Amino acid sequence: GSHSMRYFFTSVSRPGRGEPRFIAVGYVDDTQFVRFDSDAASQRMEPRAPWIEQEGPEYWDGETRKVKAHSQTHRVDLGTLRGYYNQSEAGSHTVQRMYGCDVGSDWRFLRGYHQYAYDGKDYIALKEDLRSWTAADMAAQTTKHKWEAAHVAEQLRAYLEGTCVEWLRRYLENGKETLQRTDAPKTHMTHHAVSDHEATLRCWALSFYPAEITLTWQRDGEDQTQDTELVETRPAGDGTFQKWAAVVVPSGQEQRYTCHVQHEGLPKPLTLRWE
């Protein structure tokens, strides 16, 4: 019954003209609830879930102010990193940041996160103790030295263990109808003859929430990975997710195979077998 709140930020420099493209999104578990896109007309943090619309003007003015300060920090960062890595000013580069907190089943603080990447690779990250930093290279090492002297970890820890968790709990309550509801996968199996002597059984899991799920095939009661294929979990677009796993079997032997589905929304895992 654990939950999380996470913010993702992406800034891409545009050397040909103007400022970096900046996009921020906020999520509670697998539900996006706010966003900011520097290319949008509003220039304001905007709602992406019904339950956040409950917040008043002071909330939106504050989040907008803060998210714009975030974008300027990234803008400066892109410049700083370009120097650290001694890179040309003509190329486009990317800085990403993600932070947030998790509450355990006890609804108490479980852990906090605060990490950064440059051009798609780890740059610097706050360790789990929220007191030390993991720097991936020497550019990141200089950042680490600066943040230790400025005591940045202490400041983040205060937010992650306090404010972060307090708001996560507030959002969970306000949007409890959806956020505290699990949607069990709706499952079924399809049959497709691939030849005169072989067929493909495909096991479907649709409209589930949260995204975490496990689909496994067994043949005569034992796990089988050969002759199988499982697609990456994908968004249905209405807030739920989909996934499927398939296996090729000898025509006529379909009955030996069973699809097993594990999901938080299922009191007990489901077992499917072809008709």
């Binding site: 909330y59 504050g62 803060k66 975030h70 920090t73 400066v76 950064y116 950042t143």
Partner: peptide
């Protein structure tokens, strides 16, 4: 709710 202060790299 977003963090309040953002330190530069």
């Amino acid at each position: 709710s977003l963090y309040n202060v953002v330190a530069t790299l």
